[PDB]
């Protein structure tokens, strides 16, 4: 049996750590909800 535990509030945080890039990828989605690259 799976159970849930509170982890916090859902709020926007000013001065948060800004990281990560913005890539444009050609993807395909199959019937099993799985993505792949084209």
């Amino acid at each position: 049996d799976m159970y849930i535990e509170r982890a916090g509030d859902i709020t926007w945080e000013k001065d948060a750590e800004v990281t990560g890039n913005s890539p444009r990828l050609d993807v395909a989605l199959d019937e099993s909800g799985d993505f792949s690259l084209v």
């Binding site: 799976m2 159970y3 849930i4 990560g20 909800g33 690259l37």
Partner: protein
Amino acid sequence: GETTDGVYRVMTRRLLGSTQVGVGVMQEGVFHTMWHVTKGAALRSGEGRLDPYWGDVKQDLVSYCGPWKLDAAWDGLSEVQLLAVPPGERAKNIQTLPGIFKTKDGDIGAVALDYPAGTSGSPILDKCGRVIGLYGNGVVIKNGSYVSAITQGKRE
């Protein structure tokens, strides 16, 4: 039991110790998570029980106690915040500018942050704090890193 709004960890005791299998959002008495986190199984919230109400394997989403309530969309131009809740680690907001998943049926937002699979279901937010989607379903790029889609459901 507990139905206060907020982000929650999805745990299991079926393996060794307590293992975090995913994350979800509680909003308007409905728990929202990714399908692959629970497989549609019932969840426990203290003494209470949450039963699945809606789910779809292709969208990779599932709601508990009621229909999907999250309907905010990425505006296609602004930075977002992945509120990551990693296994054994404290919840933390990461600001990023999403990329794009180009598909045969249109484009989807994509956050390029790599976290352990147990972080699946973590909410992605707009400047207003609204949940624009969940993190945890995407693809593995040439580098090895994960790029997840901004997955949003439909509010009836």
